[PDB]
Design a protein around this nucleic acid. Structure first.
Lengths: 199, 394, 153
RNA sequence: AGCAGAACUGGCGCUGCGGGAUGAACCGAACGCCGGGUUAAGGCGCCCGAUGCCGACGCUCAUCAGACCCCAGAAAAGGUG
RNA sequence: ACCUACUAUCCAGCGAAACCACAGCCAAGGGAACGGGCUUGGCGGAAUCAGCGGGGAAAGAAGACCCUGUUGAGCUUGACU
RNA sequence: CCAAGCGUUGGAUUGUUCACCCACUAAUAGGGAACGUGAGCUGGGUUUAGACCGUCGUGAGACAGGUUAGUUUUACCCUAC
RNA sequence: CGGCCGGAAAGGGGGCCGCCCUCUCGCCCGUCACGCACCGCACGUUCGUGGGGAACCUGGCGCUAAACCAUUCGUAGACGA
């Protein structure tokens, strides 16, 4: 009932356009690993794209001007907000269903992350083109927690490896379990093959 | 059109929010970073401004016109009684910033520190930490305290210490001590935690933290000056005498299509009581407080290698509007922020000090202890007695 | 006469009313809202503290340019004031209202005011003198005050 | 010259509607109150109804890319991109 | 730069006036050619106090500067009677 | 070539914009924001009514021809700070 | 049912040790019998001991505080703070 989308390898505008439509349909979408979001075009193109965005501020009072968010999660939150009717009541009610996170929170580390193949770099971009990581772009423009998130993301990398290697050994005993017991499960096995489930 | 003759703007915009400080005690916004090679030590201390006086010293800077000459320097007197460590705090480090992990206090807390946890000490029953101090005489409590300490061994990255000043030794009217987190910089987390556990309920003198001829940073609140105009706060040009609506103002504020008045224009408002951070202050001398041995006390705080006089740094009649300095003190070159009796934050430098100025040792020759309550002309009381002689009242 | 609100129980209720009282309407309404819910002996004690500047009257509606004081934080407000004539005229009225209750045989020490209403009286006519031979109005603002107390334990 | 003065016809003035982000003159189409269906001009990644077609063929990398009549900005010349 | 008096500040009391389509946060666009309202965006949090003069193309008076009226007045003369 | 980060002065004369000269300086660059800025200041000049001189007109009077003296109102409303 | 540990980036009633009672009842096939068979008809069927609020229950376990005003201070200040 809650969409947990992994942001690694996902294009900024293609993911935001699909999330914005799903969020407006009453679906709670949680986007995770926003530092893995990457944008087509060379890195130097996107930097001045964001640096000239920084220059756009209110002259008389910059505190009332555009709030330039530097975190990768809030940058992705900004581009979804521009894809939504946030000036209306239903637009702001939609944005409450969106939840962005840098790295992976402990609420969402022990969960399966969904992947949008339509909003993917490997699908929508030619292999000879250039792309820019949002995580590198954020720290290079004012984000202070890239190395902070990298070590905490490093910490859960072997912690899931322990779970996965235990998971393989857990189902290695499962796959070996049929190997001793075909003589008394063939009654259930063949009817699962006539209907096409193990063939 | 354009401005006829160019001139730099009045006032820096880095100190733009010239409001009254939300805090009264100076705050360390950025503690010095730590490396595991150094031993564990304190990085900040909290003192109180007493007064200022002269100094005489030899200059040993090569290549100057003033080399090997006697000079006078304005020096601040900051009375710095030792602290009492009452607790420690651990900090886990998050992608959203720095977050406190767990705060562990002492078993019994002195009533000077208990003043801070109350807005009204007279009406209160002084019931703070009464059930928390019951955790130290039950066997489940000690195991929980060790479990809390063992939890900070694993997860905490930055460890600070909670220490408070001692109002009993100071001559100030107030008795409410100021709590302060001081970051402990040194080795790894484990020995850092064990060192602060030992230092609980212990006296921390100034000499552990700072040393002589060392760059430090002074953090404090500006002297209050109340509501002020643009001429006093921003130092703008006074308008000529022929102005009708006044002359201590700003004449042209803004342009037309800039339909809002800008944030960069000098306007009247609160002047003073601003939080400030002054860097590169030189410690000429870390003094010693009054102490009694063999019956009589020792007060030769103003004694140097050449003066050898048993006078103290307290001038004739005491420091103006402060009192008498009886505890140990630090002597900082140049004026510091804040008025008399103002709480001052002392902090180690955030920059690597390798200069001719910052590595020059100081040898004091004469400390001026004359009366600052007017044009004083005598160092000690008995020197004036030898000059005046007998009086009518004798 | 024809009161603005009928009491839920006329046997346990007493009334008082003051018409064309020369006191400012805006100061009277502000102290009428703060006096509405309290007990009658709590009401009289509070009114004496207003005269002695011990407890303030929180100005909520007619508060343009009214200075703020430290005593308004007890009311969850910032702007406070201590109107003297406004509290003094409606101090005699509960004294009038106390006499009506004892004449009806009601218990004085348990009366609770529930309704108090301040209505604008007709404005008196004076004048002031301005520049270039001009005369401007000097409207007085008296007001009508009527309240109803009720027995409640 | 969004300047002044003429010829034919159509519009605005006198006129709402869909579209061109908006818009007196542009495109389509003119109007009693409604239901169903179907279109014009325009569009069909999100705002924003509609391509979430297993769309076809090629061109293009910009450290100032480009994106739809009116229309809202560009020339001569040069490039072993 | 500092000092004094009366204000300005607050309080006890008494207490108006000008002005007021509705009311008031901005960037760009278009528009009757310099928008608080329209479009696209930036965004937006009760009630207030002391200042302040950027804006409200601020308030004062159917522009006296210019022109028209087959509207006049003071004055002059080689205008007409 | 990148480059507006930081600076671009004190004075004689003239209301001056502009202009010239003296001196210093690293340099004394050019400009916009209703030809920025009068409820911020000044009224020196243009540009009333009083006058003087030159030219023109018989005359009343005229002169991007000079000279002289000539009331610079109001925030306590909303926004912005 | 008790412990035991594993969780700190915004942390689970997760697993393991022994317990006094429980059945091969758990589940899949096949026999016996029963269950308003409400006589064709709709928001049925859960998460739901859902969140919040008064009042009623039963007992156990407990705790006997602060803030503000006033006054004072003057490191502060128009008033507040």
């Amino acid at each position: 009932q809650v969409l947990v989308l992994d942001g690694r390898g996902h294009l900024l505008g293609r993911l935001a356009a699909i999330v914005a439509k799903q969020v407006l349909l009453g679906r709670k979408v949680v986007v995770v690993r926003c530092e893995g979001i990457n944008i087509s075009g060379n890195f130097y193109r996107n930097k001045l794209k964001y640096l000239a965005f920084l220059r756009k501020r209110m002259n008389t009072n910059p505190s009332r001007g555009p709030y330039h968010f530097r975190a990768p999660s809030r940058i992705f939150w900004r581009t979804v907000r521009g894809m939504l009717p946030h000036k209306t009541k239903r637009g702001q009610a939609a944005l409450d269903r969106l939840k962005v996170f840098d790295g992976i929170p402990p609420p969402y580390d022990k969960k399966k992350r969904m992947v949008v193949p339509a909003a993917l770099k490997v699908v929508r971009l030619k292999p000879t083109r250039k792309f820019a990581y949002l995580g590198r772009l954020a720290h290079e423009v004012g984000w202070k927690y890239q190395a902070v998130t990298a070590t905490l993301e490093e910490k859960r990398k072997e912690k899931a490896k322990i779970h996965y290697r235990k998971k393989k050994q857990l189902m290695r005993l499962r796959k070996q379990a049929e190997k001793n017991v075909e003589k008394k499960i063939s009654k259930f096995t063949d009817v699962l093959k006539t209907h096409g489930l193990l063939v | 059109s354009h401005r006829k003759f160019s001139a730099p703007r009045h006032g820096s915009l880095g100190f733009l929010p010239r409001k009254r400080s939300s805090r009264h005690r100076g705050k360390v916004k950025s503690f010095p970073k730590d490396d595991p090679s150094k031993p564990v030590h304190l990085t900040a201390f909290l003192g109180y401004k007493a007064g200022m006086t002269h100094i005489v010293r030899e200059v040993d800077r090569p290549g100057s016109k003033v080399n090997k000459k006697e000079v006078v320097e304005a020096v601040t007197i900051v009375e710095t009684p030792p602290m009492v460590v009452v607790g420690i705090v651990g900090y886990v480090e998050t992608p959203r910033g720095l977050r406190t992990f767990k705060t562990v206090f002492a078993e019994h807390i002195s009533d000077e520190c208990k003043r801070r946890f109350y807005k009204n000490w007279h009406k209160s029953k002084k019931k703070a930490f009464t059930k928390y101090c019951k955790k130290w005489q039950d066997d489940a409590g000690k195991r929980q305290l060790d479990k809390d300490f063992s939890s900070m061994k694993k997860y905490c990255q930055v460890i600070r210490v909670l220490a408070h000043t001692q109002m009993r030794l100071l001559p100030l009217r107030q008795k409410k001590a100021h709590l302060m987190e001081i970051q402990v910089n040194g080795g790894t987390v484990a020995e850092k935690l064990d060192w602060a556990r030992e230092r609980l309920e212990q006296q921390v003198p100034v000499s552990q933290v700072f040393g002589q001829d060392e760059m430090i940073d002074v953090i404090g609140v500006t002297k209050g000056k109340g509501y002020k105009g643009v001429t006093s706060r921003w130092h703008t040009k006074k308008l000529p005498r022929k102005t009708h609506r006044g002359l201590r103002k700003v004449a042209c504020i803004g342009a037309w299509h800039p339909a809002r008045v800008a944030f960069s224009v000098a306007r009247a408002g609160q002047k003073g009581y601003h939080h400030r951070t002054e860097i590169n202050k030189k410690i000429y001398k870390i003094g010693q407080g009054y102490l009694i041995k063999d019956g009589k006390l020792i007060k030769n705080n103003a004694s140097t290698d050449y003066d050898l006089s048993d006078k103290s740094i307290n001038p004739l009649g005491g420091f103006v509007h402060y009192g008498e300095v009886t505890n140990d003190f630090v002597m900082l070159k140049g004026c510091v922020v804040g008025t008399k009796k103002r709480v001052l934050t002392l902090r180690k430098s955030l920059l690597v000090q390798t200069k001719r100025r910052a590595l020059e040792k100081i040898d004091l020759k004469f400390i001026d202890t004359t009366s600052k309550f007017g044009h004083g002309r005598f160092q000690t009381v008995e020197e004036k007695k030898a000059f005046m002689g007998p009086l009518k009242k004798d | 006469v024809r009161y603005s609100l009928d009491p839920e129980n006329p046997t346990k209720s007493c009334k008082s009313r003051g018409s064309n009282l020369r006191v400012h309407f805006k100061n009277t309404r502000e102290t009428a809202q703060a006096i509405k819910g309290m007990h009658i002996r709590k009401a009289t004690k509070y009114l004496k503290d207003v005269t002695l500047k011990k407890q303030c009257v929180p100005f909520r509606r007619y508060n343009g340019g009214v200075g703020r004081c430290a005593q308004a934080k007890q009311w969850g407000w910032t702007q406070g004031r201590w109107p003297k004539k406004s509290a003094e005229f409606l101090l005699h009225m509960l004294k009038n209202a106390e006499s009506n209750a004892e004449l009806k045989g009601l218990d004085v020490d348990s009366l609770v005011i529930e309704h108090i209403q301040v209505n604008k009286a007709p404005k008196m006519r004076r004048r002031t003198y301005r520049a270039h031979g001009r005369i401007n109005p000097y409207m007085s603002s008296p007001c009508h005050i009527e309240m109803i107390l009720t027995e409640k334990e």
